[PDB]
Structures are given as structure tokens and as C-alpha cells.
Design a binder for this molecule. Structure first.
Ligand code: EF2
Ligand code: ZN
Length: 105
């Protein structure tokens, strides 16, 4: 199981080989201001998304990064966020682990 697809429609999104240990773990669990919990997996790279609007620094979970919502490009399901404007790396993807399906290439 080396590739991740959108759990709702099957759109190709990312790969196990593209997981990124930010802060020493690719997995981060975080809460938004509405108290929703997200088990976030960091990826260096993703595809098949649509990044919505312009970046925002408000409530950013990752120091020095601004965020844009990442929808599945096919079905519109909220898969995570694209993070940017930071350093080493300048950008990365934080994707919600239970909204993805993992399986064979
Ligand atoms: O790093 C992030 C990404 C965006 C995320 N976020 C949300 O998931 C959310 C839902 C409702 C209102 C405001 C927010 C918000 O800033 C958040 O809390 N931090
Ligand atoms: Zn989808």
C-alpha cells in the first residue's frame, strides 16, 4: 500500500514515499478553533488537490507557515491544507489521515 487516494472518490493524492517528518514525526494531532481534532500526516508533495484562496497565517499549527485549504480536486472533499511561506521546507502538505485510503500503486 504505497499510494494514498481520496477516500470519497478515489482521486490519486499522494504516496507513502512522500511522507515528511516535520518536527521529527510525519503525524501531528491538532485542533482547530471549532474544537475539531485532526490527525494530520505531513507530505512533501501531493497531487489531485485544489488549493483554495490565498494563504492565511491565522491559527497556523506550524510555526512560520501560512495555510490554504486543500480540497480533493475531483469531489471537493476537504483533505487538508497546503502550508507555505516558511523555511526548510518552504512548503508542504498536511493531509487528514482518515480522509485518505491507502493501497497498491
Ligand atoms: O494550521 C491551521 C490550518 C487551518 C486550521 N483552521 C480550521 O480547520 C478552521 C476552521 C474554522 C475556522 C478557522 C479554522 C482554522 O484556522 C487551523 O486551525 N490551523
Ligand atoms: Zn475525492
Amino acid at each position: 500500500a504505497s499510494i494514498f487516494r481520496c477516500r470519497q472518490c478515489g482521486q490519486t493524492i499522494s504516496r507513502r514515499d512522500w511522507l515528511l517528518p516535520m518536527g521529527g514525526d510525519h503525524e501531528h494531532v491538532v485542533f482547530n478553533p471549532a474544537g475539531m481534532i485532526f490527525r494530520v500526516w505531513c507530505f512533501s508533495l501531493a497531487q489531485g488537490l485544489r488549493l483554495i484562496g490565498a494563504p492565511s497565517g491565522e491559527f497556523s499549527w506550524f510555526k512560520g507557515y501560512d495555510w490554504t485549504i486543500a480540497l480533493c480536486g475531483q469531489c471537493g472533499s476537504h483533505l487538508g491544507w497546503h502550508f507555505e511561506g516558511g523555511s526548510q521546507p518552504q512548503t508542504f502538505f498536511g493531509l487528514i489521515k482518515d480522509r485518505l485510503a491507502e493501497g497498491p500503486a
